[PDB]
Amino acid sequence: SSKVVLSEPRVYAEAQEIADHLKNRRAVVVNLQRIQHDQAKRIVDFLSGTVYAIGGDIQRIGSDIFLCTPDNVDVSGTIS
Amino acid sequence: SSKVVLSEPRVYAEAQEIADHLKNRRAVVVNLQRIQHDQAKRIVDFLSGTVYAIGGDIQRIGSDIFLCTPDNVDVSGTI
Numbered sequence: 001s002s003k004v005v006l007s008e009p010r011v012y013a014e015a016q017e018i019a020d021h022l023k024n025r026r027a028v029v030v031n032l033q034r035i036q037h038d039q040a041k042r043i044v045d046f047l048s049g050t051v052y053a054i055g056g057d058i059q060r061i062g063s064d065i066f067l068c069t070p071d072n073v074d075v076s077g078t079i080s
Numbered sequence: 081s082s083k084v085v086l087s088e089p090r091v092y093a094e095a096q097e098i099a100d101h102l103k104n105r106r107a108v109v110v111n112l113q114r115i116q117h118d119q120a121k122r123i124v125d126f127l128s129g130t131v132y133a134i135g136g137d138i139q140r141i142g143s144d145i146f147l148c149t150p151d152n153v154d155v156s157g158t159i
Contacts, residue, residue: 002082004107004149006141006157027084029109031142031159061086062111065142069084077086079111 002073004028009035012042018068019050025070033064040064082153084109092119095126098148102136107153112144120144 005021005028007014021028030047032040044058047068051058055071061079069075085101085108087094101108110127112120124138127148131138136150141159149155 001152001154002107003154003156004084004147006139006147006155006159008157008159027082029141029147029159033142059086061109062113062142062145065145067084067086067109072081074081074083075086076083077088079086079088079109080114 002027007031009043012039012046015043015046015050018043018047022050022054022056022068022070025072027070027073028068029061030066030068031064032066082107087111088114089123090115092122092126095123095130098123098127099130102130102148102150103134105150105152107147107149109141110146110148112146 003026005026007028008031018028056069058068061067083106085106087098087108088111098108128138139147141147
């Protein structure tokens, strides 16, 4: 019924695919633990701009991993 | 609208609170980065039994981090 996408991007360009998911109202788990760190930063910044624009959110869920949500997904709880 | 719960348990007994969320049709992200490693294992095994019982799923989504879902959440892609 609801859909969550798991994403492990290799290059900065793959952020566009993630943003398309968000625009289509799906949450996306973004694992950046195994990407070049300079590229990870770029992804996160791009996705911050995406979510800012569509009224969603982006939240760190662990070391170099994030949950991006559209406005139709409420997230509760926190991770240190 | 849907709800996703973020959990960072510190003791094994908190796996019950995660299981309650799943029985109530919410996905839970379970970050086991801060718990003792021996106890992480035991949480992950407890949750596999829970999801087995209710027809959901458990998927590793990074180091020491898992996505548990009930049957009403479809997960696509992999990590």
